[PDB]
Design a protein around this nucleic acid. Structure first.
Ligand SMILES: [Mg+2]
Ligand SMILES: [Mg+2]
Lengths: 52, 34, 141, 324, 109
RNA sequence: ACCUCGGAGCAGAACCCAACCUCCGAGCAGUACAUGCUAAGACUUCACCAGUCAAAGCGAACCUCAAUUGAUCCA
RNA sequence: AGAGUGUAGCUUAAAAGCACCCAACUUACACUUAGGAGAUUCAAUUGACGCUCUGA
């Protein structure tokens, strides 16, 4: 099963996007495009919105 | 390591074996058909 | 001034006018078929049993330029007409012919194995160093 | 209903119960070759093309090939993938042997024949070497359809056609500013005595190319006619207008097109100087105008359409207030 | 015992037959499988729907089928095809009507 | 017993077609993190709601999947 | 003695395309890449050098 997690930008911007990951996998870090910064920046999982 | 002369000799060896076995296969096929 | 009489709309009849301006249409379809028709000029390489052919062909099918190792001029200067040396030489000849023909951009559409082929790599490098870019400019809409 | 086919259906002759015995395309390459051949072959059904469409020489060549094979160093380099080819010699031999045919192909592609001669073709048997002198040091050659700027083409070119009575004509095919089906004559040297060109009769003085700005790429053709017997020929644009088809219709009996060389030119500052000083006119500036975007007839109630629907049809972006 | 099967028809098929003037972006035909393959100036959506990439006249033709070399299933089918056999498919083309544009005299400098 | 969704016949060929008719399935999973932003023109499950495809452009690089879901209010 | 006559294996090809072989990948084949040899029988459409058939 998977869970929905809010990945939050490490760029200081309050930009958050929701993704899905396995409940049994480590906390998730991606390089996602930040429209506020107009550049790909690191996003780190912060919270689990719901389990899907 | 190897040298240019022996590489050339090997290439000519491949050439002559190509010709030889080409003739071999041609004669084999000729006997087959005949 | 009589010389100043100019028609309101100009009619440039050169077939390569819009192609050089990067404005002509290039067939964008055929997404389920190979090769793609989305080009103005295509570099087509045919490796026969004995010879090597290199054509620069417009999308309409006209063979704008050709370079064959079957021609005396080229075949009288190389040992084998079906090897990497032959492919590189014919590629350089085609590059010179393209530059003198005014063709500077093309779209090469090789199969995976043809692209991996050493002879095709040598031919592409020969064209590139001769001054032909194997990547046509994007159309301007 | 089943209407019978109007001809041989594809894959009909081969189809037979002996599929296992029949050999198969083991290679995408051979399948593609066969498919391309079939596509080129004509068909009775609607197709894409319908809508969008001596012995001494052999002996000498065989001896030369045998000599090249015997030369060990040649084989050494060939097998070491290091051999090269003399590009200049290849070019000269191409000119001598098969250059005329490829040049004819280039002319047909560029549409010279369909415009200069209304479709009538001719092989340029006699090579034509034209080059515009750049500076006092170098010179840009005009091989076939290559690009030469009007700045380079400002002064008349040097022509060296190897032969032993000729007429040379420079014709701009699409530079006409008033008539779509018309030409410009830039210089016409008639009754040229062989190789030397300076002795030709200057029927019309040399006028540098002047492709209008934003008017696209223009093509310029050097037509060389062998003259069987000498014949007499007959800055104002009205008289620089020309029709090569009619000219060759008049002079066909005594003229035969034996040389051809053309190049492409686009606008340059020398074109501005040509227009203002030589021609004494306001230079025309052209722009590529695309057709206006298509929009469906505006509906009173654009159901499910975005708010941009009204913007698609409003002409002025500035606010308007009607009676107020 | 038999449940389901209440789905309605997709209303798929040809939206523009041959000879129909079609504007850029118009959907020509919607299909579940590749019944009609994309021809010249015809693009395919994610759901295999054919849309006109240009403004022109729709034409249906039969053309030889040469799949991309990386289309493994079609390449295998070809490899198993007997010599002399050529696949044919129905292609949809949009013959553009208007030219890309015209050169107009804008300023007599 | 069933109630929603999808595929195949009935419904052979543009579309659409009932049945407490015949059969299969779904209420995910996987990969990616530009799976971003915009925008012509179209399709549309016979209404609406909803659902689809997408040129060009910006910004970049140089989604698979038939269904795989649920409005408003309110939290 | 008479007839058909005649491009490397095949070509209502005109010095070409298919064929064909080994080297590597394959157990192997196949594919692919690298290479390989190859012919218009001889003299002026005609005659005579080679093959097939009809006889002794
Ligand atoms: Mg049904
Ligand atoms: Mg509807």
């Amino acid at each position: 099963k998977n869970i929905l997690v809010r990945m939050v930008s490490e760029a200081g911007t309050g930009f958050c996007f929701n993704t899905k990951r396995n409940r049994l996998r480590e906390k998730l870090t991606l390089l996602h495009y930040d429209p506020v910064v107009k550049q790909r920046v690191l996003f780190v999982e912060k919270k689990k919105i719901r389990s899907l | 390591e190897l040298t240019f002369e022996e590489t050339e000799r090997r290439a000519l060896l491949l050439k002559k074996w190509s010709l030889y076995k080409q003739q071999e296969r041609k004669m084999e096929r000729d006997t087959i058909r005949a | 001034v009589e010389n100043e009489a100019v028609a309101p709309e100009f009619t440039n009849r050169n077939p390569r006018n819009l192609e050089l301006l990067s404005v002509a249409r290039k067939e964008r379809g055929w997404r389920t078929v190979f090769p793609s028709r989305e080009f103005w000029h295509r570099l087509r390489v045919i490796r026969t049993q004995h010879h090597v052919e290199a054509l620069v062909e417009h999308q309409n099918g006209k063979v704008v330029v050709s370079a064959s190792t079957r021609e005396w001029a080229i075949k009288k200067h190389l040992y084998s007409t079906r090897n990497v040396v032959a492919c590189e030489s014919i590629g350089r000849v085609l590059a010179q012919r393209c530059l003198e023909a005014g063709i500077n951009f093309m779209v090469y559409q090789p199969t995976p194995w043809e692209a991996a082929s050493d002879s095709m790599k040598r031919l592409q490098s020969a064209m590139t160093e001769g001054g032909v870019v194997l990547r046509e400019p994007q159309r301007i809409y | 209903r089943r209407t019978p086919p109007l001809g041989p259906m594809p894959n009909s002759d081969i189809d037979l119960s002996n599929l296992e015995r029949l050999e198969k395309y083991r290679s995408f390459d051979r399948y593609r070759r066969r498919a391309e051949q079939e596509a080129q072959a004509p068909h009775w059904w609607r197709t894409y093309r319908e809508y969008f469409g001596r012995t001494q020489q052999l002996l000498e060549r065989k001896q030369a090939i045998q000599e090249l094979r015997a030369n060990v160093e040649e084989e050494r380099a060939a097998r070491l993938r290091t051999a090269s080819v003399p590009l200049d010699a290849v070019r000269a031999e191409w000119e001598r042997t098969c250059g005329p045919y490829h040049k004819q192909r280039l002319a047909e592609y560029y549409g010279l024949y369909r415009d200069l001669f209304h479709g009538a073709t001719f092989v340029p048997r006699v090579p034509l070497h034209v080059a515009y002198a750049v500076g006092e040091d170098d010179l840009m050659p005009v091989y076939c359809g290559n690009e030469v700027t009007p700045t380079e083409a400002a002064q008349a070119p040097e022509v060296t056609y190897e032969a032993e009575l000729w007429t040379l004509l420079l014709t701009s095919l699409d530079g006409h500013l008033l008539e779509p089906d018309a030409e410009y004559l830039h210089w016409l040297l008639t009754n040229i005595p062989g190789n030397r060109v300076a002795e030709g009769q200057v029927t019309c003085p040399y006028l540098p190319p002047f492709p209008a700005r934003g008017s696209g790429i223009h093509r310029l053709a050097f037509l060389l006619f062998k003259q069987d017997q000498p014949i007499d020929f007959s800055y104002q644009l009205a008289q620089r207008t020309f029709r090569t088809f009619d000219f060759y219709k008049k002079h066909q009996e005594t003229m035969t097109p034996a040389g051809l060389s053309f190049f492409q030119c686009r606008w340059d500052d020398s074109v501005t100087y040509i227009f203002h000083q030589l021609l004494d006119m306001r230079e025309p500036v052209f722009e590529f105008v695309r057709p206006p975007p298509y929009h469906p007839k505006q509906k009173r109630f654009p159901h499910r359409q975005p708010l941009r629907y009204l913007d698609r049809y409003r002409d002025s972006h500035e606010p308007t207030y009607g009676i107020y | 015992k038999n449940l389901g099967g209440k789905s309605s028809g997709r209303r798929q098929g040809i939206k523009k037959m041959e000879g129909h003037y079609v504007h850029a972006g118009n959907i020509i035909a919607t299909q579940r499988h590749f019944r009609w393959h994309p021809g010249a100036h015809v693009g395919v959506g994610k759901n295999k729907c054919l849309y006109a990439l240009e403004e022109g006249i729709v034409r249906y033709t039969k053309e030889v089928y040469v799949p991309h070399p990386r289309n493994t299933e079609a390449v295998d089918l070809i490899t198993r095809l007997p010599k002399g056999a050529v696949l044919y498919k129905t292609f949809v083309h949009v013959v553009p009507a208007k030219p890309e544009g015209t050169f107009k005299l804008v300023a007599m400098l």
